Design a protein around this nucleic acid. Structure first.
Ligand SMILES: [K+]
Ligand SMILES: [K+]
Ligand SMILES: [K+]
Ligand SMILES: [Mg+2]
Ligand SMILES: [Mg+2]
Ligand SMILES: [Mg+2]
Ligand SMILES: [Mg+2]
Ligand SMILES: [Mg+2]
Ligand SMILES: [Mg+2]
Ligand SMILES: [Mg+2]
Ligand SMILES: [Mg+2]
Ligand SMILES: [Mg+2]
Ligand SMILES: [Zn+2]
Lengths: 173, 189, 51, 141, 191
RNA sequence: AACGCGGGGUUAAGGUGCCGGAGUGGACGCUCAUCAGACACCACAAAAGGCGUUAGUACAUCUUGACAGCAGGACGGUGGCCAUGGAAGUCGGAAUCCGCUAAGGACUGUGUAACAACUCACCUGCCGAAUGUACUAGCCCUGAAAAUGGAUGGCGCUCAAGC
């Protein structure tokens, strides 16, 4: 519930030498619409010669997942900055929505590469339709046939306020 | 990979052009046995094979060139070849069985059948009596020749052979290791 | 010494590698030193032969 | 050959396993996501035992000894409901010791002050017969 | 990256029996009894078939999984020793001073003792005590040979290493002075 | 964040295992150090390395059977044209053919005065899914030596009470 995917459409301000300017559309992941629009101008400034003071926003809409109850495999392309230089990566995730996949990606990059939110560009998010499109071995073991496994050494849940138990707890639940 | 590509068209053309397809299992046969059988049957019949074919003949079973090709799929196991010829099954029954070789021991090879040296005179120089005394086999120097008066068993059947015994068997020119082309079922005949 | 026994004894104190950083005696086919004080270095040389 | 092995034997997470959640609800596993999350739903007629369709974290669930046979992977709510009632999940869950413990706990928490007085007096009358019987067997040693 | 399932198997001959209880392994056979304690490893044992033992590790790390094959080999050696036994051989190597070895069987403790004399012409006398269950013997098939045999590979190997490590040359070039007692052959009592 | 004397409510910077008012709170990962680490100013550490572990980039091989191990084979001109008491691939000077196959050189190495043998390259029995090389940057490790007994504030902490 931290992120949502938005559609943002923007335009250069019309002038007499060019009425009816072109329209550009981007897909932005953001926690709210105030930072969705700020993110839009950031990316457009890097591609076209437009600013916020010489343009305007046309439309903002929320894109919802079409089947948020079906398990899917996702692939993501991204570009990030390390302490010296920039690099490209491709990672994979398994969940039920595009928003869930992006949230897991941001946590994963912070843990394994110490990359902050401010140094990551998302290039493309694609749902992998065929089971033959899975590349990473940590996903392949999850799409194996006839999967099943037990849960050994499970610690029982005990109220914090209850100190001084009178029996030795078990771990076979 | 060019030879392997050439092998594909070679197998595909040859199996169709030769209705008589034979199966031969050849395991541990020296180079000269193939060379002599190839020259002898260079005029008539072609002998050729290679690595095992699990889909190469499936490429032939895909079209109904021969419906029997799909009945030969489980037969191939390994190191088994095919024979193409224009002759008859009776004449090829023992045409490829000729020129059986006699292979010596490999210093520890298992002899399936028990071997025993017959009593008699060897007829060689007794200067190599160190070989016999190393194993402690009684030998007699008669007329400047080595003779074994009493029969001495060499090795129990199915038991390995020591290097000294293997050298003796090599110089005795007697061994039970005879190598030839083994036969296999052909076209469920 | 009989030649076979000379080979047998030489296996334990002649055929070795030596770490160029800490002089450790290492197996003949090694690629990294097994000692931590040099950081498992990979600069190895053979043990000198006696001629 | 004699082999004598004594070790553990756990219940496995699998398609068809029935879970029990924190608030006494039940659900059946239809799809495995990770080693920590599972997609499940329970289409039960009893409003106290039914749960919607969604993802459950395994840390907040317990594995019951009930497994629905031949439940297809990824089956929808209609197919699960048909298999749920054909097998008789509600009847099987009522015969377990977990259910009986829950029922006993509910009854004791619903006692009023007058009920608490009467349960004390009724226990004494049963206790009187217990002491007489225990004295008889112990005296005979 | 954790692996959901890793497994190994162990076949068992019809001449022996195996018991597992709280990760304590007991192997019983025609030549004696052996025990091993494996309570430092988190593993699950099971009976796969009529004469096959199974080993499993669930949700294991790369470091944790490496110990699965190790446990399999250790128990497998336990079965081999109880049914066939182990047998090491050692050889005397010297240039000038002959090495004298005397072996005696102690009575109070039931162990074997080995004494070494005249090593590079030294006056000191070396003594080593073998582990219980390990038997020593001077060879008669050839000269300057020792033979160690027993049921436990761990016991036989460590005792043989004790003899080899006690005879060392100090303050000399060991590429030139090669005297000592060294292991030369490893095998089984039967076959 | 700026100040008269008091009562009630809410917060800032900073905190919530104990000293100590308030979570042994929730989610996903990384780390095992015989010198771990633990919060701006601030009370220090570098060049250079690791087949420790984790993620990534590029190229190449492989169910027409790849890497490992074991097992078998390893042919004519041709002892090449030349050297020669002797050199047959292997003192030495100088090129590199086809038949035979799926397959062996007018040869890598050991070896003979020279042969031979053993090879080896190379191919083939067995096996059943991956494998090889070079790079990028996270935590940990090496690099890391001073004088009274001692300081993440202390105690202590390891799916943390560390990042
Ligand atoms: K916690
Ligand atoms: K690294
Ligand atoms: K502090
Ligand atoms: Mg000196
Ligand atoms: Mg106040
Ligand atoms: Mg906190
Ligand atoms: Mg407090
Ligand atoms: Mg560095
Ligand atoms: Mg290979
Ligand atoms: Mg202080
Ligand atoms: Mg604290
Ligand atoms: Mg934290
Ligand atoms: Zn070193």
């Amino acid at each position: 519930g931290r992120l949502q995917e938005y559609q943002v459409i923007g335009r250069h301000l019309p002038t007499e030498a060019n009425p009816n300017p072109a329209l550009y559309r981007m897909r932005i992941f953001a926690p709210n619409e105030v930072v969705a629009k700020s993110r839009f101008w950031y990316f457009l400034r890097g591609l076209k010669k437009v600013k916020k003071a010489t343009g305007e926003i046309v439309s903002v809409n929320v894109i919802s997942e079409k089947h948020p109850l079906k398990v899917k495999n996702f692939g993501i392309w991204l570009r990030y900055d390390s302490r010296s230089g920039t690099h490209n990566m491709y990672k994979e995730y398994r969940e039920t929505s595009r928003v869930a996949a992006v949230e897991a990606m941001y946590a994963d990059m912070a843990a394994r590469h110490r990359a902050r939110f401010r140094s990551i560009h998302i290039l493309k998010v694609v749902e992998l339709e065929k089971t033959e499109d899975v590349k990473r071995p940590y996903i392949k073991q999850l799409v194996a046939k006839n999967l099943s496994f037990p849960l050994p050494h499970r610690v029982p849940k005990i109220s914090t306020k209850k100190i001084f138990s009178a029996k030795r707890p078990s771990t076979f639940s | 990979s060019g030879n392997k590509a050439g092998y594909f068209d070679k197998l595909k053309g040859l199996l169709e052009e030769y209705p008589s397809i034979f199966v031969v299992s050849v395991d541990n046969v020296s180079s000269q046995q193939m060379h002599e059988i190839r020259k002898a049957l260079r005029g008539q019949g072609v002998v050729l094979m290679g690595k095992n074919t699990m889909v190469r003949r499936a490429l032939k079973t895909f079209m109904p060139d021969h419906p029997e090709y799909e009945r030969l799929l489980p037969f191939v196991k390994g190191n088994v070849g095919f024979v193409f010829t224009n002759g008859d099954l009776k004449e090829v029954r023992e045409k490829i069985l000729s020129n059986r070789i006699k292979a010596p021991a490999r210093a520890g090879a298992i002899a399936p059948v028990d071997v025993w040296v017959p009593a008699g005179n060897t007829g060689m120089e007794p200067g190599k009596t160190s070989f016999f005394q190393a194993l402690g086999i009684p030998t007699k120097i008669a007329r400047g020749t080595i003779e074994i008066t009493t029969d001495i068993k060499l090795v129990e059947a199915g038991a390995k052979v020591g290097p000294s015994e293997a050298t003796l068997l090599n110089m005795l020119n007697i061994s039970p290791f005879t190598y030839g082309m083994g036969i296999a079922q052909v076209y469920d005949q | 010494i009989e030649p076979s026994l000379k080979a047998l004894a030489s296996k334990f104190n002649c055929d070795k590698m030596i770490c160029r950083k800490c002089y450790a005696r290492l197996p003949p086919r090694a690629t990294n030193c097994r000692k931590r004080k040099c950081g498992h270095s990979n600069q190895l040389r053979p043990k000198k032969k006696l001629k | 050959a004699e082999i004598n092995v004594e070790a553990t034997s756990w219940r496995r997470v699998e398609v068809g396993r029935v879970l029990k959640l924190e608030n006494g609800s039940l659900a059946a596993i239809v799809e495995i996501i990770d080693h920590k999350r599972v997609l499940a739903d329970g289409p039960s007629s009893d409003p106290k035992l039914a749960t919607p369709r969604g993802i459950v974290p395994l840390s907040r669930a317990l594995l019951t000894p009930i497994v629905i046979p031949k439940l297809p992977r990824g089956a929808r709510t209609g197919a699960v409901k048909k298999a749920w009632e054909a097998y008789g999940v509600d009847a099987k869950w009522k015969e377990t010791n977990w259910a009986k413990k829950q029922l006993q706990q509910e009854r004791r928490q619903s006692l009023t002050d007058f009920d608490r007085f009467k349960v004390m007096r009724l226990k004494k009358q049963r206790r009187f017969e217990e002491r007489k019987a225990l004295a008889k067997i112990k005296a005979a040693a | 990256m954790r692996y959901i399932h890793s497994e190994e198997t162990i076949p068992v001959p019809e001449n022996l029996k195996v018991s597992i209880k709280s990760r304590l392994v007991t192997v019983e056979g025609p030549r004696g009894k052996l025990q091993k304690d494996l309570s430092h490893i988190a593993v699950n044992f099971s009976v796969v078939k009529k004469g096959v033992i199974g080993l499993e590790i669930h949700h294991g790390s790369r470091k944790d999984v490496a110990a699965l094959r190790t446990v399999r080999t250790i128990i497998n050696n336990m079965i081999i020793g109880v049914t066939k036994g182990f047998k090491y051989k050692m050889r005397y190597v010297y240039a000038h001073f002959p090495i004298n070895v005397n072996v005696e069987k102690n009575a109070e403790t039931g162990c074997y003792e080995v004494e070494i004399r005249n090593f590079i012409g030294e006056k000191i006398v070396r003594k080593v005590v073998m582990a219980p269950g390990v038997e020593v013997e001077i060879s008669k098939a050839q000269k300057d040979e020792l033979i160690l045999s027993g049921n436990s590979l761990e016991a036989v190997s460590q005792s043989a290493a004790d003899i080899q490590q006690i005879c060392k040359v100090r303050n000399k070039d060991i590429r030139k002075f090669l005297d000592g007692i060294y292991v030369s052959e490893k095998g089984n009592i039967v076959e």
